[PDB]
Structures are given as C-alpha cells and as structure tokens.
Design a protein around this motif. Structure first.
Motif, short mmCIF file in Angstrom:
data_model
loop_
_atom_site.label_atom_id
_atom_site.label_comp_id
_atom_site.label_asym_id
_atom_site.label_seq_id
_atom_site.Cartn_x
_atom_site.Cartn_y
_atom_site.Cartn_z
N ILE A 76 0.87 -1.17 0.00
CA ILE A 76 0.00 0.00 0.00
C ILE A 76 0.91 1.22 0.00
CG2 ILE A 76 -1.82 1.27 1.17
CD1 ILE A 76 -1.34 -2.47 1.85
N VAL A 77 0.88 2.01 -1.08
CA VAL A 77 1.76 3.16 -1.25
C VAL A 77 0.91 4.41 -1.18
CG1 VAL A 77 3.40 4.33 -2.73
CG2 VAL A 77 3.26 1.84 -2.81
N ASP A 78 1.35 5.39 -0.41
CA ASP A 78 0.71 6.69 -0.45
C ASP A 78 1.77 7.78 -0.53
OD1 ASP A 78 1.21 8.06 2.26
OD2 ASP A 78 0.33 6.18 2.94
N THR A 79 1.36 8.94 -1.03
CA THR A 79 2.23 10.11 -1.10
C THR A 79 1.86 11.14 -0.04
OG1 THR A 79 0.86 10.93 -2.92
CG2 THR A 79 2.88 9.73 -3.50
N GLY A 80 1.48 10.65 1.14
CA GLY A 80 1.17 11.54 2.24
C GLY A 80 2.39 12.15 2.90
N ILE A 81 2.20 12.64 4.13
CA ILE A 81 3.24 13.39 4.82
C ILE A 81 4.44 12.53 5.19
CG2 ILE A 81 2.21 13.14 7.12
CD1 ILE A 81 2.80 16.26 7.39
N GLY A 82 4.28 11.22 5.27
CA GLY A 82 5.38 10.36 5.67
C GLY A 82 5.64 10.42 7.16
#
Ligand SMILES: NC(=O)[C@]12CCC[C@H](CCC1)C2
Length: 209
Positions: A76-82
């Motif tokens: 599951i990959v997201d480009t959120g704040i990390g």
C-alpha cells in the motif's frame, strides 16, 4: 547499520492479540491501512495550503495498491506526509499505548477487532494477514527509513538504500501462506468498494503480468 528495538509491552500485547484471536473478518486490514494513508495525505495537503513548497517532493496525492504474487506481498503506497525516524520508533506516529488500553477495554465489553481504527491503532491490523510488515517512509524533514517487524516483541529501523520515494509511506505486507486471496484483483476490488468508497484520493489497483 540496523537498530533493533523492543515494542512497549502494551504494543506487543496488542500484536499478540491480533495474531492469536480467532477472528474471521480479516479483510478490514485493508480499510484500516487505506484510512491511515488518507489521514497522511490530508496532513500534507493541509501543510501545502500555506506553504506550496511542501509539495516540492511530489505534487500528486494518491494511494496505490500493488499485489505481487511472486513475492507474496501486497504493498500500500501513499504520497502523504510520511514519517520521521522518531515517528517510526514512536509506534508509527500513533498514541498506541493509550489506544491499546482503550481498545482492549472495548473488546472485553463486547467490541470486536474490526473496530480497531476507532482507537488509533489500525496499522497493527496488518498482522491479521501478514507474517512480516515492512514500512518504507520519507518525510520532508528527514531521510528515507525502513521499519520492519515479524512481531515477536521487536522491530528494526534502518536507513533505506532502496528506490527513493520522494515523500510518503509504503506498507509492504508479506502475507501469510493462507492469506493469498488478498493478492487477487477481484478480492481487492471488492474490499475497496465495500469499505473505502468515501476515501477522497485516487486508489489505483495495479495489475500483474
Ligand atoms: N477513491 C477511489 O479511487 C475510489 C474508492 C472506492 C472504489 C472506487 C470508487 C470511487 C472512489 C475508487
């Protein structure tokens, strides 16, 4: 250079409960991880409203679901704040000690495991289906790190020399042998449609060769 840490006792207890309790409705792990991704995307979006340079590390705000039957992984990959290194060590940015206490007090009074996200510890539902979880993360204010745990009371953190991510979080689920249904396109589609219909970011289910 790999650092090994002990989980706080309460978090180890949460993980053993998730692993050992008989509970058939395992598919909620995906809803919980997607909800965590949505929360992380909201955070970077909010920061970008007053500082556009926060998106210099990537303007696209999305969630990708990447099954790989050869590796037996669902990512599951997201480009959120990390997450910073400190966030990773501090229970992946959660208040997991107080959340676990409330969750276990809810279970003995009739709640079930599917309500885990109401207690802020939904990440750990990954262990319903994964024997090992690897989290690769990059926050604007820190370097790229890999967290990993097969439960058993410990986790590791190392600087990640892998493919640079720009910004966000990748949760790699190394699935249990009997949980490979979560690599099948029609099963993932069904779960996303059932539980994630109101997530306000594009969820792309990748297909395999
Ligand atoms: N966020 C999205 O990509 C979805 C999530 C629920 C299933 C599909 C319907 C429209 C929203 C895709």
């Amino acid at each position: 250079e790999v650092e090994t840490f002990a989980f706080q006792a309460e978090i180890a207890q949460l993980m053993s409960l998730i692993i050992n309790t008989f509970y058939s409705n395992k598919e909620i792990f995906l809803r919980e991880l997607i909800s965590n991704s949505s929360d992380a995307l909201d955070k970077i979006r909010y920061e970008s409203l007053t500082d556009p340079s926060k998106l210099d590390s990537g303007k696209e705000l999305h969630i990708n679901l990447i099954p790989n039957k050869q590796d037996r992984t669902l990512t599951i990959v997201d480009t959120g704040i990390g997450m910073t290194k400190a966030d990773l060590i501090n229970n992946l940015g959660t208040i997991a000690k107080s959340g676990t206490k409330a969750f276990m007090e809810a279970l003995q009074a009739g709640a079930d495991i599917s309500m885990i996200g109401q207690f802020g510890v939904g990440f750990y539902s990954a262990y319903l289906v994964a024997e090992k979880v690897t989290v690769i993360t990059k926050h604007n204010d820190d370097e790229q790190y890999a967290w990993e745990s097969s439960a058993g009371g410990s986790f590791t953190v190392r600087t990640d020399t892998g493919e640079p991510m720009g910004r966000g979080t990748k949760v790699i689920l190394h699935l249990k042998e009997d949980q490979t249904e979560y690599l099948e396109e029609r099963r993932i589609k069904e779960i996303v449609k059932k539980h994630s219909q109101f997530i306000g970011y594009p969820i792309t289910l990748f297909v395999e060769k």
